Design a binder for this molecule. Sequence first.
Ligand code: C5P
Ligand code: C5P
Lengths: 204, 201
Amino acid sequence: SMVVAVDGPSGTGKSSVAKELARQLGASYLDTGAMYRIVTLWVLRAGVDLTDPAAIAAATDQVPMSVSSDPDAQTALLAGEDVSVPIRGNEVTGAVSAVSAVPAVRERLVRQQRELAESSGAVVVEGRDIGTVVLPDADVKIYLTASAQARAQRRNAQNVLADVQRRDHLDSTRLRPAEDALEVDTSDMTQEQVVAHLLDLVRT
Amino acid sequence: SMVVAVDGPSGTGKSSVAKELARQLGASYLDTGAMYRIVTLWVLRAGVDLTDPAAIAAATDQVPMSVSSDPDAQTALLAGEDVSVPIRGNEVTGAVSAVSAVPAVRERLVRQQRELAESSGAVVVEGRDIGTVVLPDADVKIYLTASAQARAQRRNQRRDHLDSTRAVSPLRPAEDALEVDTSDMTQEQVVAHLLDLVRTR
Ligand SMILES: Nc1ccn([C@@H]2O[C@H](COP(=O)(O)O)[C@@H](O)[C@H]2O)c(=O)n1
Ligand SMILES: Nc1ccn([C@@H]2O[C@H](COP(=O)(O)O)[C@@H](O)[C@H]2O)c(=O)n1
């Protein structure tokens, strides 16, 4: 059954495109970045020292987390609380890479990600290492990319080209596409154009 | 005039003791941990990547911060907003060490701390590196400490090792500091003790 992995950096509209690709394939959708963000919110609220990986590992043994695989009903639950809003806040955005870098944390989420994928049948799974690490035997692997400039304009309008260009260098020396991935430059494209493009690639 | 530095780990009541010492000496009070917490709140709200020191340095060039040196009128203002509550929340508590470890950040706050101290006359300045780095020629230097056990119960051993071996500002008393074990003492007992030490030097 069909597993589509969608990876790439931020600011390209990756998440919206993956959602809409899922709807069009009648498939399920899995937002992996949201899972990291949920754990991050959990860590922040316990007040764990973010400079201490062992403390982050210890504090994330039993994160009471739930996420939907329905692209039309995405909710982020933590301890029964709907945390869809706070997991997108700047606090979590600033903290998420501290928590994501802890191996113990990845180990669990990669496992949770694999299980959700196997039990979802037809599924589009979105993130950064889906095609390389999490689901290396995906049927189709897509790497959505865009120029620094394109990505910068999508952010400064959300409300930068310096900030976005900086993060590219630190990531390179710290995002790498799988060998069998299909690289798609979305710089010139709108969302619907990107969706149609991926539908074409998948249906080939 | 008189500059009293009070340093030590967390969980001994250090801040309450330093406040009350200030009141009793008729001195001013400076809560330096608050200043790190205010910057941290600023960083968190800008959504700066905490794993990136250069980004934290860049995002903290111009932190609009204000803090009082009056022990009875402590407020923590950021961009005009009273942030006394949020700077004590867990989010900031968890993040503050990431931000505190950035040299550029310390460099500024240490400078701001020295200036506030000079202009406050008689002042008790509280923190972790006050007697060693910020005010190394304080008149009286106090290192408030307590056993792991005592500190643990007041929450109702890991952090001790990480603090000891930390890169930017490891936690160590000045050679000329007066080490005071507060394990057996209540707060008012500690206050009386420091009043005695200060009124003997
Ligand atoms: N597969 C993934 C997905 C997200 N992440 C983390 O999540 C953050 C942003 O997540 P989003 O994909 O939700 O924007 C990144 O900074 C990264 O640290 C990750 O480390 N691996
Ligand atoms: N003088 C100081 C005071 C605080 N700090 C930092 O500020 C944090 C918060 O201090 P408080 O918990 O005492 O407010 C400490 O955990 C430490 O990371 C520092 O590095 N130097």
